[PDB]
Amino acid sequence: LTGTGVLTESNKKFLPFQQFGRDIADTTDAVRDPQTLEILDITPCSFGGV
Amino acid sequence: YFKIYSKHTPINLVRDLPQGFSALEPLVDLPIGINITRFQTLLALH
């Protein structure tokens, strides 16, 4: 799964079966790392209209 | 893929199911790949 975003520690709890967080419009809010099982929040990199 | 969802809760009412909302989480998913049309339940008998 390919995406561009900042990776941060994820406060939201995930049950063991659960692997991917869901956003409103078909994008992945959070991901659990495959190698080590910790939830990571995904935030899109800062963009501001100029 | 055989999917089993299991939830365990203490039950006050012996006779019937308690009214209430319970969410069942999948314990495991297994690739048995067999067709099942009937099922039976095993009870240990003293």
Curated annotation (Swiss-Prot), chain A:
Note the superkingdom of the native organism.
Viruses
What's its job?
Attaches the virion to the cell membrane by interacting with host receptor, initiating the infection. The major receptor is host ACE2. When S2/S2' has been cleaved, binding to the receptor triggers direct fusion at the cell membrane. When S2/S2' has not been cleaved, binding to the receptor results in internalization of the virus by endocytosis using host TFRC and GRM2 and leading to fusion of the virion membrane with the host endosomal membrane. Alternatively, may use NRP1/NRP2 and integrin as entry receptors.
Q: How does it assemble?
A: Binds to host ACE2. RBD also interacts with the N-linked glycan on 'Asn-90' of ACE2. Cleavage of S generates a polybasic C-terminal sequence on S1 that binds to host Neuropilin-1 (NRP1) and Neuropilin-2 (NRP2) receptors. Interacts with host integrin alpha-5/beta-1 (ITGA5:ITGB1) and with ACE2 in complex with integrin alpha-5/beta-1 (ITGA5:ITGB1). May interact via cytoplasmic c-terminus with M protein. May interact (via N-terminus) with host bilirubin and biliverdin, thereby preventing antibody binding to the SARS-CoV-2 spike NTD via an allosteric mechanism.
What name goes with this protein? Spike protein S1
Q: Which gene is the coding source of this polypeptide chain?
A: S
Stretch of the intact protein here:
546 to 595 of 1273
